[PDB]
Amino acid sequence: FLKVKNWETDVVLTDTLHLKSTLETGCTEHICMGSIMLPSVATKDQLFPLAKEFLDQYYSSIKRFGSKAHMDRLEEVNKEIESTSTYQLKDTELIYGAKHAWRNASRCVGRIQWSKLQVFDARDCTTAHGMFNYICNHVKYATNKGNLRSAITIFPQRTDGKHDFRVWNSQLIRYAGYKQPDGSTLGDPANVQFTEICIQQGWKAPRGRFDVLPLLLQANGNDPELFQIPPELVLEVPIRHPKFDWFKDLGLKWYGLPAVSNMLLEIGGLEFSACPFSGWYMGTEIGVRDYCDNSRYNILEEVAKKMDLDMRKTSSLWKDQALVEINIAVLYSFQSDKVTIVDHHSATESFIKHMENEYRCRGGCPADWVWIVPPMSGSITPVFHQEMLNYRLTPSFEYQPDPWNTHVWKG
Amino acid sequence: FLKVKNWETDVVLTDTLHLKSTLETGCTEHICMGSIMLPSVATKDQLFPLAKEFLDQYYSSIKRFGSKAHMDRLEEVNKEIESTSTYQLKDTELIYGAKHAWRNASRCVGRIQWSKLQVFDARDCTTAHGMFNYICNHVKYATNKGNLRSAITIFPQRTDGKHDFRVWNSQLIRYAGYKQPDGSTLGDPANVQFTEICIQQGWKAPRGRFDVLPLLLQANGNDPELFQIPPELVLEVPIRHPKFDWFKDLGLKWYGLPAVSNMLLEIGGLEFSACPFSGWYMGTEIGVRDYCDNSRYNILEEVAKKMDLDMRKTSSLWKDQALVEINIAVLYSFQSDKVTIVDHHSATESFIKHMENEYRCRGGCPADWVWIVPPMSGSITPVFHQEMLNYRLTPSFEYQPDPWNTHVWKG
Ligand code: HEM
Ligand code: HEM
Ligand SMILES: N=C(Nc1ccc(CCNCc2cccc(NC(=N)c3ccon3)c2)cc1)c1ccon1
Ligand SMILES: N=C(Nc1ccc(CCNCc2cccc(NC(=N)c3ccon3)c2)cc1)c1ccon1
Ligand SMILES: C[C@H](O)[C@H](O)[C@H]1CNc2nc(N)[nH]c(=O)c2N1
Ligand SMILES: C[C@H](O)[C@H](O)[C@H]1CNc2nc(N)[nH]c(=O)c2N1
Ligand SMILES: OC[C@@H](O)[C@H](O)[C@@H](O)CO
Ligand SMILES: OC[C@@H](O)[C@H](O)[C@@H](O)CO
Ligand SMILES: [Zn+2]
C-alpha cells in the first residue's frame, strides 16, 4: 500500500492498484531503469489465465461480477481456446479492452480522456485495400473538421504470427525524410528509412519538406501495398506567430492529427499488431521535439537568427528564448484554425486532476514521470512536483519491432 | 552487463559498475519508484565488511591493492573495531571517501569536478564555537572572491548517536522566511520553520526578504547555538537583466555560494552527520526553482507583469516566456560580477562528457535522470536524450532527518 506525494501541494495519495500489476518493469531492488527508453506465437496454456483475468475485470466493471453471464463467458472462452487455441472478443469486450489499454498507458499525459474513445472494429478486414478504407474512415472521423475526437481502429488479431496485419508507417500521417548529396536531410530525418522503403516500393516522392507519406499496409502477413491518403482528409496547420510576421516566412506547418500506428494492443492475451490510435497534440510534441530535436527538424538555428539573438554564447539562453516563441506559435496557429490542441500547462494540470480520480475510484494510476513531464518548462508544470508510481497493467499498448525487420518477404 | 543508449547521438555505453552496487533503490521488478523524492547506532558486526570494502577499493585506487600496507591496515582497523567498536580514517582515506561520495552522488549533474574537491578535516572539533570557526573558514575559502572552489568540512563522526554534530541549517547561506498576518510569506517560504526556530532561540530578525539566516550549530549532541556569519564573507549577486532596465527595480539578489549542510556523509560504515559541502550554482536552481517554484519566491507573476504579457490565458506561455528572461538575468548578473556559475546547457554537456569518462575508466556512472534533467528546456539539453542507470554506490551522501525532530533537548 504505497504512498505518492505532491511536493507543490502536499497532497498525498495511496496506491493499491499496483498490487494488480503482473508484468515486470526492468528495474530490480538494486538498479532503477526508469530512463531506459525500451524495456525488455503464444501457447494455449498461456492464454486462459489472460482471458480469465481480463474477463473477470470486465464483468466486475459492469457491476455483474460472477453472475450467470460471467460463468457462461468463462466457460465459453475456455471451450473456444480448447477448440482453436485462440478466441474472439465481444464487441463490448473489445471496447473495454481498448479504452483500458489507453487508461493503463503510463507514459500518456492525456489519459483524463480515456473513457471518451471511439472504437472501430476492423476485425472483418482481409486486404490492404480494406485496410486503406478503414484508415481513411478513421482519419475523416477523428479529424472532424479540426474538432478532434479520439479513436482507434482494430484490425484482426495475430493468430499464427506469419499472418500479421501491420501498418508500416509509424504514424498514419508523417512527413517524408530524404537525405541529400551533401549528407544533409530534407523533410523529417526521423522517417528517412521509411521514406526510402516507400520509394523502394515505387513511391514517387515530391522531394520537399512537409511531404505527407503514403500508407504502407500489410494484410494477413502478405507483402504490403502503397496507398496515398486523399489530401482533403489531411488537415494541416500552417504555423504563424502572433507577433513576429517573419515567422510566416519560415514556412512551417504540421498536421493536425497524431495517429500512432506501429504499436501492439494486447487484450486478454490476444495481440492486435495493427491498431492505429489517434487523439490530439500537446503543443510541445510539435514545437519542442518535432521542430527542435537536433535529429529532427532542428529549427532553433533559424528562429534564433530571425529573432536577432546573441548566439555566440551558450549562456545567453538563445535556444531557450527561441523555444518558447516557437511553442507560442504552434499553439496560436492551431487555435486560430479551430484545430484541437492542448498546451503543456493545461495538459499537465488535467493529468493531476485525472490522477486524483484514478487513485479515488480505482486506487492508483500508473505514471512514467520521465515521459509525463513535458520537455520544456518542466518544473513550472504541476507534474514535475508529483511523485508517480510506474507499473504495468493490462490491457496495454506495447512496442513491437518494425515489420521490415521481421517480415519473411516472398515477392 | 547492461547497456545505456543516447538517442540524440546513438552513442552506447556498457555498465558493469552497477554490479558493485550493494544498497537498494526502492524499486522492484514490478514497480518503479524512480520519481519518489526520498527513498527508504550500528553494531560492530556490521562495521567491518563496510571498512573492508572501503579499504579494499582505496588501496586498489592508489595502485597498491593487497600489498603489505593493505593487509596491515585491514588488520589495524579490524583490531580497532574490536577495541572500540568504531574506528578512525586516515587523512588520505577521509579525502578519498569524501571525493567518492560526491563521485557516486547520482542526482548531481556537476560531478565532472568530483576529483577537484578540498577536504577540511574538522574531526578535532568539540564546540559550536569551533564549528562556527570551521564553517567561516570554509565559506571564505570556497567563495574565493567569486572564483568559487569546491570544498567540504567534515566534523566528528557519529559514535553513540546521542552525541551528534549537526548543522541545523539546510544550507550554510539561506535567506529567511517569515509568514505574515495575512497568511502570505515574506522571504523564502522554504525556510519558515527554520527561521522561527532561530527566532525561538533568540534570533533578532530584520524581517525583510533576503535576510541571511544565522547558523544554528549543534556540537557533541548538545543544544545548538546561534552564530551570524560575518557579512563580509557572504557574497551576494544582485540580479539585473541585460535588456530590461526595470529588472533592477525588481530588487532581486541571490548568494553566490551553495553549501549544503543537512546531509549525512557515509564512509566505510562511519557516519558524519555534519559535513557541509559547497560548489557553485547551475543557473536553473536559482532562476527556475528558487525564484519560480509556486511554493518558493514565485516571481513569475511580477516578471510577466512588467514584461507586458498576455496573462489571461494559460496557452500564451507567459510563464515560459518570463522563465527564460529570468534565467538570462541570473546568468548575466553572476557572470558580470565574476562569480562562478554554470548554465544548464554547459552543465549538462559536461555531464555527458563526464559520463563517457566514468564508463571508460570506471565502467559506469550512477545517474538519476529525474534529477539530472534541468527543470527548464529539458529536451534541448543533451541529458534528456541520455539513458541513465541509477544505483547506489558507497561512499555516499545520504539524507537524514532534521535535528529538531530527533534531538532529546534538556535545556
Ligand atoms: C486525447 C489526446 C491525447 C493526448 C493529449 C496525448 C498525449 C500524449 C503525449 C504528449 C505522449 C508522449 C508521446 C511522445 O512524447 O512520444 C503520449 C504517449 C502515449 N499515448 Fe497519449 N495522448 C492522447 C491520446 C491517446 C490515445 C487516444 C491513446 C491510445 C488509444 C494514447 C496512448 C498513448 C500511449 C500508449 C503512449 C506511449 C507511447 C510510447 O511509449 O511511445 N494516447 N500521449
Ligand atoms: C561543483 C559544482 C556543482 C554543481 C554545478 C552541482 C550541481 C547540482 C545540482 C543542480 C543538483 C540538484 C540540486 C537540487 O535540484 O536540489 C545537485 C545535487 C547534488 N549534489 Fe551536486 N553540484 C556541485 C557540487 C557538488 C559537491 C561539491 C558535492 C558534494 C561534495 C555535491 C553533491 C551533490 C549531492 C549529494 C546532490 C543530491 C542532493 C539531494 O539528493 O537532495 N555537488 N548538484
Ligand atoms: N524508437 C525510436 N525512436 C522513437 C520512436 C517512437 C517514440 C515514441 C513516439 N510515439 C509517438 C506518440 C505516441 C503516442 C502519442 C503521441 N502523441 C499524441 N498526442 C497522440 C497520438 C495519438 O494519440 N495521441 C505520439 C520515441 C522514440 C528509435 C529507434 C532507433 O532510433 N530511433
Ligand atoms: N525535503 C523537502 N524539500 C526538499 C529539500 C531538499 C531538496 C534537495 C535540495 N538540495 C539542495 C542542493 C543539494 C546539492 C546541490 C545543490 N546545489 C548546488 N549547486 C551545490 C550546493 C553545494 O554544492 N553544489 C543544492 C529537495 C526538496 C521537504 C520535506 C517536506 O517539505 N519539503
Ligand atoms: C533517455 C530518455 O529515456 C528519453 O530521452 C526519453 C525521455 N522522456 C521522453 N518523454 C516523452 N514524452 N517522449 C520521449 O520520447 C522521451 N524520451
Ligand atoms: C516529484 C519529483 O520526484 C520531484 O519534483 C523532484 C523531480 N526532480 C528534481 N530534480 C532536481 N534537480 N531537484 C528536485 O528537487 C527535483 N524534484
Ligand atoms: O509526438 C512525438 C514526436 O514526433 C517526437 O517527440 C518523437 O518522440 C521523436 O522526437
Ligand atoms: O538549489 C536548490 C533550490 O533551493 C531548489 O531547487 C530546492 O530544491 C527547492 O525548490
Ligand atoms: Zn525504477
UniProtKB/Swiss-Prot annotation, chains A, B:
Subunit field text: Homodimer. Interacts with DLG4 (via N-terminal tandem pair of PDZ domains); the interaction possibly being prevented by the association between NOS1 and CAPON. Forms a ternary complex with CAPON and RASD1. Forms a ternary complex with CAPON and SYN1. Interacts with ZDHHC23. Interacts with NOSIP; which may impair its synaptic location. Interacts with HTR4. Interacts with SLC6A4. Interacts with VAC14.
Described purpose of this protein according to its UniProt entry: Produces nitric oxide (NO) which is a messenger molecule with diverse functions throughout the body. In the brain and peripheral nervous system, NO displays many properties of a neurotransmitter. Inhibitory transmitter for non-adrenergic and non-cholinergic nerves in the colorectum. Probably has nitrosylase activity and mediates cysteine S-nitrosylation of cytoplasmic target proteins such SRR. Inhibitory transmitter for non-adrenergic and non-cholinergic nerves in the colorectum.
Keyword Iron: yes
Gene Ontology CC terms: azurophil granule; calyx of Held; caveola; cell periphery; cytoplasm; cytoskeleton; cytosol; dendrite
Annotated L-arginine binding sites: Q171, W280, Y281, E285
Family to which the UniProt record says this protein belongs: Belongs to the NOS family.
The organism's place on the tree of life at top rank: Eukaryota
Cellular localization per UniProt: Cell membrane, Sarcolemma; Cell projection, Dendritic spine
Organism per entry: Rattus norvegicus
Protein name as it appears in the record: Nitric oxide synthase 1
Gene: Nos1
Free-text description of this protein's post-translational modifications in UniProt: Ubiquitinated; mediated by STUB1/CHIP in the presence of Hsp70 and Hsp40 (in vitro).
